[PDB]
Coordinates of C-alpha atoms in Angstrom, one line a residue:
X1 CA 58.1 124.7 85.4
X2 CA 61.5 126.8 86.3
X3 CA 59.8 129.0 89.3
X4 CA 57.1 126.0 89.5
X5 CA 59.8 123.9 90.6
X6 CA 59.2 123.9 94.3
X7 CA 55.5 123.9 93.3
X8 CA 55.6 120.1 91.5
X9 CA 58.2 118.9 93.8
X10 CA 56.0 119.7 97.1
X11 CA 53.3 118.2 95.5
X12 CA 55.5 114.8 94.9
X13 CA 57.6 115.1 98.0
X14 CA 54.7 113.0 99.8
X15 CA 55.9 110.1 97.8
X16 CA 59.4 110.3 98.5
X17 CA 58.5 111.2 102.5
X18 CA 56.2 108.7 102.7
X19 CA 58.3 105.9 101.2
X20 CA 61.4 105.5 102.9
X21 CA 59.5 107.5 105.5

């Protein structure tokens, strides 16, 4: 997922925002 790279890291930055977050 070169260009999709943004796309499944948006979708799993909740995880790392919400964590130490």
């Amino acid at each position: 997922g070169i260009f999709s790279k943004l796309a499944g890291k948006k979708i799993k930055n909740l995880l790392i925002s919400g964590l130490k977050g």
